[PDB]
Design a protein around this ligand. Structure first.
Ligand code: 54G
Length: 167
């Protein structure tokens, strides 16, 4: 049993809810929250900007030190950093950004990072301002992630479309 409430079960391991991932993290304090990161861990907008704002910029301060030591992530890659006030850990995952011309085939590699964690609270990778089709992102999630993933979809209209269209 876990603390996640009000999710619709899509598969054996994938759950979905219309929720603000920031508000959801604050309530649940999950072991792992996933950030929709970029390779520079520059948390300006979308999920990264909202998560980072909720940490009072501590996520950005930690991230800048990580990049100064390690250099940029790979598209499709990840790193584990603090979850600050939102979670034990934040798994920063880089999905391909279609609005920068990145190979959408890298979305499966991105979701494979989730399999290193038994339970996660996550957004749909490469959705929102990363420009991918969220229906596609949910299909790759279901077909790639084998651990237990709780998906927070920000947009109510999109949430209803994802559920209604799910195969
Ligand atoms: C907080 C937040 C901001 C932008 C977004 O696109 C999402 C999401 O896709 O789930 C969430």
């Amino acid at each position: 049993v876990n603390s996640f409430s009000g999710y619709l079960k899509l598969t054996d391991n994938v759950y979905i809810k219309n929720a603000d991932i920031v508000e959801e993290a604050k309530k649940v304090k999950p072991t792992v929250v996933v950030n929709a990161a970029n390779v520079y861990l520059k948390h300006g907008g979308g999920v990264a900007g909202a998560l980072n704002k909720a940490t009072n910029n501590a996520m950005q301060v930690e991230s800048d030190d990580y990049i100064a030591t390690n250099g940029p992530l790979k598209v499709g890659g990840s790193c584990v950093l603090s979850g600050h006030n939102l979670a034990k850990h934040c798994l920063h995952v880089v999905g391909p950004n279609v609005n920068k011309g990145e190979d959408i085939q890298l979305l499966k590699s991105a979701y494979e990072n989730f399999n290193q964690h038994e339970v996660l609270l996550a957004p749909l990778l490469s959705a929102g301002i990363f420009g991918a089709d969220p229906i596609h992102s949910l299909r790759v999630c279901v077909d790639t992630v084998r651990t237990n993933v709780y998906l927070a979809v920000f947009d109510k209209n999109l949430y209803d479309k994802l559920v209604s269209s799910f195969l």
